[PDB]
Paper text:
The [name] ([name]) is an Fe(II), 2-oxoglutarate (2OG), and l-arginine (l-Arg)-dependent oxygenase that either forms ethylene and three CO2/bicarbonate from 2OG or couples the decarboxylation of 2OG to C5 hydroxylation of l-Arg. l-Arg binds with C5 toward the metal center, causing 2OG to change from monodentate to chelate metal interaction and OD1 to OD2 switch of D191 metal coordination. The best characterized [name] is that from the [name] (formerly Pseudomonas syringae) pv phaseolicola strain PK2, for which several crystal structures have been reported. This enzyme binds mononuclear Fe(II) using three side chains (H189, D191, and H268) with three water molecules completing the six-coordinate geometry. Here, we extend our understanding of [name] catalysis by carrying out biochemical, structural, and computational studies of the enzyme in complex with a substrate analogue and using two enzyme variants. In combination, the results presented here are compatible with the currently proposed enzyme mechanism,4−8 emphasize the necessity for OD2 of D191 to coordinate the metal, and highlight the importance of the second coordination sphere and longer range interactions in promoting [name] activity.
Author numbering: 3 to 350
The structure:
């Protein structure tokens, strides 16, 4: 039985906010996840996004597959196209990253992963953008509360999320039709927070913290978390519950907290019916470097955009986006922009 919290609309640092942050941390440390109650507008926007997803997925495959870009990873992923731990995953997905036109300087400069969302239509665009703006408000509340719970300055995490690389995976899992029940293999997500919504069908499992269990640092190429613990208990079923979003930490929170919080491993099983879900990623700015909060002498850093780019290249080795990154050596640009960017997102 997960804990469910109502968040205040604004987080100011009062005693109630600090107390709530303590409780959020404790729930992550015990269960790996908690639920936040949605209000009528949060719920309406969730349901409108789910409905737009259902209508898009009914479109012909050739049309859905045309919603792709060789500049951004935004757009369609066919069932069986994504790889997790060397094995295909079976949802169809529409990924929404920051929507930047070719008029944006970062796109003109050829920054990896920067480009315009290949929206299927302008009603889908509006529904997803409205939903993601509401999700972002919740992400910022959660980050202020988490800072307060760790006795950190309230803006510790939000200072990294200005123009943050927030993105969302809009998912449809097919019903199980073969002997394979794997929807998505075990993995961890990459940023600060994951805020997710699901329909009534069910299929998400999460792994709580386990005393003494070593957790891979998925930001390191030699410690991918993909596939880890896939067939080992414990796995907690996330029971579909009306009127909530779930929240769990991503890789950046594990790193910054030195493992006081863990990036929650999770996986999806196919069910007897198709299943719609949306997973939202509240992320640092592409140019931000995460750092250990509790070890100021530690020199390790995570360049968030580098982590995102590495992850999406491993997910989609043959996608046109990945091919163009390799063909234009855009990973080298990524090293260049670390030192010669003009955006002012970081540095003097
Ligand atoms: N893309 C995200 N956030 N999740 O998808 C599943 C994990 C991904 N294929 C991986 O190998 O990490
Ligand atoms: O299907 C879900 O509920 C979550 C999916 C997920 O974790 C992801 O797409 O990364
Ligand atoms: Mn995930």
């Amino acid at each position: 039985n997960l804990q469910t919290f109502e968040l205040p609309t604004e987080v100011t640092g009062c005693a109630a906010d600090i107390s709530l942050g303590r409780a959020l941390i404790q729930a992550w440390q015990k269960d790996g996840i908690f639920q936040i109650k949605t209000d009528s507008e949060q719920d309406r926007k969730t349901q409108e996004a789910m409905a737009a997803s259902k209508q898009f997925c009914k479109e012909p495959l050739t049309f859905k597959s045309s919603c792709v870009s060789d500049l951004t990873y935004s757009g369609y992923v066919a069932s069986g196209e994504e790889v997790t731990a060397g094995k295909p995953d079976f949802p169809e997905i529409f990924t929404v990253c920051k929507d930047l036109s070719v008029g944006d300087q970062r796109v003109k400069a050829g920054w990896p992963c920067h480009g315009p969302v290949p929206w299927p239509n302008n009603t889908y665009q509006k529904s997803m953008k409205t939903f993601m703006e509401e999700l972002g408000l919740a992400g910022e509340r959660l980050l202020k509360l988490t800072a307060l719970g760790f006795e950190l300055p309230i803006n510790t995490f939000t200072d990294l999320t200005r123009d943050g690389w927030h993105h969302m995976r809009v998912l449809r899992f097919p019903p199980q039709t073969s002997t394979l029940s794997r929807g998505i293999g075990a993995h961890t997500d990459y940023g600060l927070l994951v805020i997710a919504a699901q329909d009534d069908v069910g299929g998400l499992y999460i792994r709580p913290p386990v005393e003494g269990e070593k957790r891979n640092r998925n930001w390191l190429p030699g410690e991918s978390s993909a596939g880890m613990f896939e067939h080992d208990e414990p796995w907690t079923f996330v029971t579909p519950t009306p009127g909530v979003w779930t929240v769990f930490p991503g890789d950046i929170l594990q790193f910054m907290t030195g493992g006081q919080l863990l990036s929650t491993p999770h996986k999806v099983k196919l069910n007897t019916r198709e299943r719609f879900a949306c997973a939202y990623f509240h992320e640092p700015n592409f140019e931000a470097s995460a750092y250990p909060l509790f070890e100021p002498s530690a020199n390790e850093r995570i360049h968030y955009g580098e982590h995102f780019t590495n992850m999406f290249m491993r997910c989609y080795p043959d996608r046109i986006t990945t091919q163009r990154i390799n063909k234009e050596n855009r990973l080298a640009h990524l090293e260049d922009l670390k030192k010669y960017s003009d955006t002012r997102a970081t540095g003097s």
